[PDB]
Structure formats: C-alpha cells, structure tokens
Design an enzyme around this catalytic site. Structure first.
Site, PDB file in Angstrom:
ATOM      1  N   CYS A   8      -4.073 -11.727  13.304  1.00 26.88           N
ATOM      2  CA  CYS A   8      -4.313 -11.296  11.938  1.00 26.88           C
ATOM      3  C   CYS A   8      -4.697 -12.510  11.108  1.00 26.88           C
ATOM      4  O   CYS A   8      -5.148 -13.524  11.640  1.00 26.88           O
ATOM      5  CB  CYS A   8      -3.042 -10.689  11.389  1.00 26.88           C
ATOM      6  SG  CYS A   8      -1.788 -12.014  11.172  1.00 26.88           S
ATOM      7  N   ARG A  14       1.911  -8.376  10.361  1.00 27.68           N
ATOM      8  CA  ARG A  14       1.314  -7.414  11.295  1.00 27.68           C
ATOM      9  C   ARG A  14       1.164  -7.954  12.739  1.00 27.68           C
ATOM     10  O   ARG A  14       1.594  -7.294  13.697  1.00 27.68           O
ATOM     11  CB  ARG A  14      -0.032  -6.901  10.770  1.00 27.68           C
ATOM     12  CG  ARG A  14       0.037  -6.146   9.430  1.00 27.68           C
ATOM     13  CD  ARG A  14      -1.360  -5.995   8.831  1.00 27.68           C
ATOM     14  NE  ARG A  14      -2.140  -7.218   9.064  1.00 27.68           N
ATOM     15  CZ  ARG A  14      -3.453  -7.350   8.879  1.00 27.68           C
ATOM     16  NH1 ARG A  14      -4.170  -6.325   8.429  1.00 27.68           N
ATOM     17  NH2 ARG A  14      -4.044  -8.527   9.136  1.00 27.68           N
ATOM     18  N   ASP A 124      -1.644  -3.631   5.418  1.00 27.83           N
ATOM     19  CA  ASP A 124      -0.688  -4.620   4.971  1.00 27.83           C
ATOM     20  C   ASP A 124       0.471  -3.853   4.326  1.00 27.83           C
ATOM     21  O   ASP A 124       0.255  -3.092   3.368  1.00 27.83           O
ATOM     22  CB  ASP A 124      -1.345  -5.584   3.978  1.00 27.83           C
ATOM     23  CG  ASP A 124      -0.341  -6.473   3.266  1.00 27.83           C
ATOM     24  OD1 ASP A 124       0.745  -6.741   3.822  1.00 27.83           O
ATOM     25  OD2 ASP A 124      -0.644  -6.912   2.138  1.00 27.83           O
TER      26      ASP A 124
END
Length: 156
Positions: A8, A14, A124
């Site tokens: 990411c 994440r 997000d």
C-alpha cells in the site's frame, strides 16, 4: 517457496492487515510450508513503525496477528517476490511505474481476487466499522487468491 508481497502507501494499516489475513488463510489450508507473506509501502515516510493499533486489535479479535513492521518497497522486492498485490489503484500504477519490465507480470490488484464483495479498491478505514470492512474484503480476496495460487500461474 512462493513469496507474496502486499503493498500500500504507508505499510501501517491495509497492507499489514493483508499480510496477516493471507498468512492465516494459508495456515487454514495447511499450506504454510509453501508460502511466505510480507508487506511494504510505496512511501518511505513511516518506515520502522508498528502496524496501526486499532487494526491490530480488530485483527486480533478475528484471529489475525497483524505484527508487521513498516518498510518501503525497494527494487530488489520486484526480483525477490513471486507476486505483488496492490491495495488500491494508485499503488498499482505507482508499482508499475517503478517496476522493471522484466517483473511487471508479478503485479496484481488485491481486489481482482474478490468474488463476492463488489469493491474496486481496499478502502482506507476512515469509523470503527471501517477496520472490519477492510478485513471483510481481505477475507474474500485472500481466500480466492490461495485457491488460484494452487491452481497454477495467476491469471485474474
């Protein structure tokens, strides 16, 4: 052994979650000897950090050990890893921008392995539910991904 990298922007939320979900899924399939998972970020800003405290807690509650330490993607990652999975579309194109031609085939979107969830990107997690939703998406994708990986070369 097959080496999987989850990518990411910062490698704090994440991407550490994706690594943790994939690890457990592999485990559940009794395939740990064959697979190794890691994560990294396109941005070096956060390098060194523990994964997001809320993500670790949420992950832990659902059987996932989010114990990743943040690090940046470096060039040798494109050689060393077998497959690299982008959490969102911006990361996807950022990765292709830096990746030697020779290795570009290795780069996939995480969401291309989703079967039931209809999302185009890993969101997000910004309230509390956002953390669960991320994990939900990763459960779907990762489960199909292990299926695919054992079937042959990735083709999604």
């Amino acid at each position: 052994s097959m080496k999987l990298l989850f990518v990411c922007l910062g490698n704090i939320c994440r991407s550490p979650a994706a690594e943790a979900v994939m690890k457990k899924v592999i485990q559940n399939h009794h395939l740990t000897e064959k697979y190794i998972c890691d994560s990294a970020g396109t941005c070096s800003y956060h390098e060194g950090q523990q994964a997001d405290s809320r993500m670790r807690k949420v992950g832990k509650s659902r059987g996932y050990q989010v114990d990743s330490i943040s690090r940046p993607v470096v060039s040798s990652d494109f050689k060393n890893f077998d497959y690299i999975f982008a959490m969102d579309n911006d990361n996807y194109y950022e990765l292709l921008d830096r990746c030697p031609e020779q290795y570009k085939q290795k780069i996939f979107k995480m969401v291309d392995f989703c079967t039931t969830i209809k999302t185009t990107e890993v969101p997000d997690p910004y309230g509390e539910k956002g953390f669960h939703r991320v994990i939900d998406i990763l459960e779907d994708a990762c489960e199909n991904l292990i299926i695919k990986l054992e079937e042959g070369k990735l083709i999604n």
